[PDB]
Copies of this chain bind each other. A is one copy, B any other.
Amino acid sequence: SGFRKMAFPSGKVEGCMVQVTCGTTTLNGLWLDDVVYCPRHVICTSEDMLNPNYEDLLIRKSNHNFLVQAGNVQLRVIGHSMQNCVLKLKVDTANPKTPKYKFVRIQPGQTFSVLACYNGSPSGVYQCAMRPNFTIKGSFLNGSCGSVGFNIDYDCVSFCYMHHMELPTGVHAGTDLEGNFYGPFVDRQTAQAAGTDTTITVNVLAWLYAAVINGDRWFLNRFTTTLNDFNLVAMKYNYEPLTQDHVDILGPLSAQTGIAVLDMCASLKELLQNGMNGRTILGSALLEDEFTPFDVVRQCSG
């Protein structure tokens, strides 16, 4: 028993991290078979970071302008191309540590692990959720660009995120591995800012179920509610609408605990309307929304 924000084991991804240098700009890349993926803004200079024309900037580069360092080994760049906001550097050596992998794009409200890296060297691993406004509440310092986010299923690494920038509120923005940004963000310095965010209702309910599975029951009640009355409350508190598909997804947890999904909704309504009256749930005084139903099932006993 116990419930923690848990990341996937990072070994498979650690084997793929490298350092990419162009000019005086150094950041991280992801080495898979004979290709290194990295943010295209490695080719920028502090002189054209405001409105860069990346096609122009790239045309003025050649293979030898890119230095790729894997551990203490120089990888020779033998081709280069852009795909959306990522650069693909073809290298003359296939990474012998390449895992089975996939490039997936994730949905807001889904979670993934982030391997924070600096100069091609991993420093830490943590769990994140893609917020409804397509940002992530990460932990990223200068040098972290190129760090990736991923999930692991069986032997297979599904890469879902590459890190590009930090917004004025301290939250983070990046792309999928095809170089397409999550959200209405661009890789150029502008006044761009996070849009308004909302709470991921289905995840809060999953976490309430985790709490019950782990013996926190003080917020339960004999009441129930309909989906529509619940969603009237959800709207009032800036929670996302709960759909019937969410109810269905919560089915396993509902059956394991014997607490019907709409009964849990009655509990969440009471918590929203009354607060916690000084109590905690799984060690938190706030309602947590970064655990999916899958995260809860994977971590919690059967």
Contacts and interface: CB of A to CB of B under 8 A. Distances in A.
A139 interface: yes
A227 to B, nearest CB: 29
B7 A124 contact: yes
A2 B140 CA distance: 6
A11 interface: yes
A4 interface: yes
Given A170-B215, A214-B170, A286-B280, A126 B4 contact: yes
A157 interface: no
Copies in the complex: 2
A280 B285 CA distance: 10
Interface in A3-22: 3-12, 14-15
Given A4-B138, A286-B284, A125 B166 contact: no
B1 A11 contact: no
B2 A9 contact: no
Interface stretch (A79-87, A115-123, A178-186): A115-123
Nearest to A11: B11
Contacts of A215: 170
B125 A6 contact: yes
Contact of A126 (B5, B116, B138, B280): B5
A106 to B, nearest CB: 18
Given A170-B2, A280-B286, A141 B301 contact: yes
B9 A14 contact: yes
A286 B10 CA distance: 29
Interface residues of A, number: 42
B138 A9 contact: no
Interface in A173-194: none
A139 B8 contact: no
A215 B11 CA distance: 33
Contact of A286 (B2, B115, B285): B285
Contacts of A115: 9
A15 B8 contact: no
Interface in A255-302: 280, 283-286, 298-299, 301
A141 B170 CA distance: 36
Nearest to A12: B11
A260 B122 CA distance: 33
Contacts of A286: 280, 283-285
Contacts of A170: 1-2, 214-215
Given A8-B124, A9-B10, A11-B15, 7 more contacts: A7-B7, A7-B125, A9-B14, A9-B123, A142-B301, A284-B286, A285-B285
11 contacts: A1-B170, A2-B138, A2-B171, A3-B139, A6-B124, A7-B126, A9-B10, A9-B123, A11-B14, A142-B301, A285-B285
